Design an enzyme around this catalytic site. Structure first.
Site, PDB file in Angstrom:
ATOM      1  N   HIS A  72      40.734  43.950  46.151  1.00 22.63           N
ATOM      2  CA  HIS A  72      40.975  44.831  47.298  1.00 22.63           C
ATOM      3  C   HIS A  72      40.393  44.338  48.662  1.00 22.63           C
ATOM      4  CE1 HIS A  72      41.269  47.303  43.559  1.00 22.63           C
ATOM      5  NE2 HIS A  72      42.322  47.824  44.161  1.00 22.63           N
ATOM      6  N   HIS A 112      45.863  50.922  53.643  1.00 23.98           N
ATOM      7  CA  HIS A 112      45.862  51.692  52.426  1.00 23.98           C
ATOM      8  C   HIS A 112      44.667  51.497  51.456  1.00 23.98           C
ATOM      9  CE1 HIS A 112      47.118  48.398  50.063  1.00 23.98           C
ATOM     10  NE2 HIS A 112      47.257  49.202  49.020  1.00 23.98           N
ATOM     11  N   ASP A 113      44.012  50.328  51.467  1.00 23.02           N
ATOM     12  CA  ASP A 113      42.741  50.132  50.719  1.00 23.02           C
ATOM     13  C   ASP A 113      41.590  49.684  51.671  1.00 23.02           C
ATOM     14  OD1 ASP A 113      43.344  50.825  48.018  1.00 23.02           O
ATOM     15  OD2 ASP A 113      44.393  48.985  47.696  1.00 23.02           O
TER      16      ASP A 113
HETATM   17  C1  LIG Z   1      47.879  42.186  38.238  1.00 19.37           C
HETATM   18  C2  LIG Z   1      47.320  43.098  37.117  1.00 19.37           C
HETATM   19  O1  LIG Z   1      47.026  44.402  37.652  1.00 19.37           O
HETATM   20  C3  LIG Z   1      46.188  45.199  36.961  1.00 19.37           C
HETATM   21  O2  LIG Z   1      46.018  45.078  35.759  1.00 19.37           O
HETATM   22  C4  LIG Z   1      45.857  46.494  37.562  1.00 19.37           C
HETATM   23  C5  LIG Z   1      45.452  47.724  36.864  1.00 19.37           C
HETATM   24  C6  LIG Z   1      45.252  48.016  35.407  1.00 19.37           C
HETATM   25  N1  LIG Z   1      45.270  48.603  37.764  1.00 19.37           N
HETATM   26  N2  LIG Z   1      45.530  48.085  38.982  1.00 19.37           N
HETATM   27  C7  LIG Z   1      45.351  48.831  40.099  1.00 19.37           C
HETATM   28  C8  LIG Z   1      44.013  49.067  40.405  1.00 19.37           C
HETATM   29  C9  LIG Z   1      43.623  49.827  41.482  1.00 19.37           C
HETATM   30  C10 LIG Z   1      44.595  50.405  42.259  1.00 19.37           C
HETATM   31  C11 LIG Z   1      45.959  50.182  41.975  1.00 19.37           C
HETATM   32  N3  LIG Z   1      46.896  50.717  42.826  1.00 19.37           N
HETATM   33  O3  LIG Z   1      46.548  51.788  43.338  1.00 19.37           O
HETATM   34  O4  LIG Z   1      47.559  49.849  43.424  1.00 19.37           O
HETATM   35  C12 LIG Z   1      46.346  49.381  40.879  1.00 19.37           C
HETATM   36  C13 LIG Z   1      45.873  46.817  38.870  1.00 19.37           C
HETATM   37  C14 LIG Z   1      46.236  45.883  40.034  1.00 19.37           C
HETATM   38 MG   LIG Z   2      44.113  52.093  46.656  1.00 22.03          MG
HETATM   39 ZN   LIG Z   3      46.321  48.949  46.901  1.00 22.97          ZN
END
Ligand SMILES: CCOC(=O)c1c(C)nn(-c2cccc([N+](=O)[O-])c2)c1C
Ligand SMILES: [Mg+2]
Ligand SMILES: [Zn+2]
Length: 323
Positions: A72, A112-113
């Protein structure tokens, strides 16, 4: 240098390698990619934004993402922004959104983050962190990201919406708030049901162009459109998807390492002694990414077919990386 220009020939394509652009921008993808997008859509012109203003905002915004945070960081903001810009050009949504709506989508994607600490909403709730207490444990980080994005637009030299109507700036802030909150994983499943019911009522024209009644329908698509941009890593080329995997995996283990000192129960996908990175990606695609992107492709077919292929491909590469 001349290599930066080469890579921005793909600004409008899903195939943009954002790692590369970061490299040719003094380690500042979010500024670069934001400048590049607004010029491409003439949003600087259409909304009376000076480059002077827009650049200093984006730089300040970009410096507010943690560079020592594995996933992030400013690079991920830059990537959701660029993805959302591609998705907004999807044929099945042609001239369906106002530029005000378009402007709200990308800007949302970029803040957004912002100021993400590298840990989950759950961690901050369980640790009784100041953010959780500030926000009563509901969409904590998402509320925060919004708080910061807008606090920077208060400084005179930084307000990029300064020459927007009072009516328009309000309609914007309302759409942006709505979208960032929608990137909270805990609202995902319900938001998937909403997209599914909307697809069953899919109305269009003869030209394969959807018809959206009012705000409710237009902000829902934009809601989910950003959500999919945030969960877009497993639909990109294999070469960029694994780089994204390693980045999130590294953030999750480091969260595991902080949970261990504290002696809190570790969250299996955050456990660096038990977690298969490969199995983690397969399930993420089966239970989260594909169901979303299948429904999105259904909404805009056949615009997203190329994307669905690559999704089901990457998926099977990760299945193969398991004994
Ligand atoms: C590329 C692989 O991505 C991941 O495994 C993964 C998982 C599980 N949760 N997230 C994730 C984590 C925080 C936030 C978000 N989202 O809000 O975009 C997604 C990711 C990117
Ligand atoms: Mg987020
Ligand atoms: Zn995000």
């Amino acid at each position: 240098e001349d290599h930066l220009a080469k890579e921005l020939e793909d600004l409008n394509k899903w195939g943009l390698n954002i790692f590369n652009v970061a490299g040719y921008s003094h380690n500042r993808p979010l500024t670069c990619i934001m400048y590049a997008i607004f010029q491409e859509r003439d949003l600087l012109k259409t909304f009376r934004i000076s480059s002077d203003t827009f650049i200093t905002y984006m730089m300040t915004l970009e410096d507010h993402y943690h560079s020592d945070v594995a996933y992030h960081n400013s690079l991920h903001a830059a990537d959701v922004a660029q993805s959302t810009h591609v998705l907004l050009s999807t044929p099945a949504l042609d001239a369906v959104f106002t530029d005000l709506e378009i402007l709200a989508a990308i800007f949302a994607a970029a803040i957004h983050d912002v100021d993400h600490p590298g840990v989950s909403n759950q961690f901050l709730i369980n640790t009784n962190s100041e953010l959780a207490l500030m926000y009563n444990d509901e969409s904590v980080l998402e509320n925060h990201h919004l708080a910061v994005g807008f606090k920077l637009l208060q400084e005179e030299h930084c307000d990029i919406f300064m020459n927007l109507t009072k009516k328009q700036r309000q309609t914007l802030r309302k759409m942006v708030i709505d979208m960032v909150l929608a990137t909270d994983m805990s609202k995902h499943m319900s938001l998937l049901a909403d997209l599914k019911t909307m697809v069953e009522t899919k109305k269009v024209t003869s030209s394969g162009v959807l018809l959206l009644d009012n705000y409710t329908d237009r902000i829902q698509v934009l809601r989910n459109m950003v959500h999919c941009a945030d969960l877009s890593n497993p639909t990109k080329s294999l070469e960029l998807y694994r780089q994204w995997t390693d980045r999130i995996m590294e953030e999750f283990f480091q969260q595991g390492d902080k949970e261990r000192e504290r002696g809190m129960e570790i969250s299996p996908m955050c456990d660096k002694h038990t977690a298969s990175v490969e199995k983690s990606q397969v399930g993420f695609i089966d239970y989260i990414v594909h169901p979303l992107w299948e429904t999105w492709a259904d909404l805009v077919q056949p615009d997203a077919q190329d994307i669905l292929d690559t999704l089901e491909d990457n998926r099977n590469w990760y299945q193969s990386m398991i004994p």
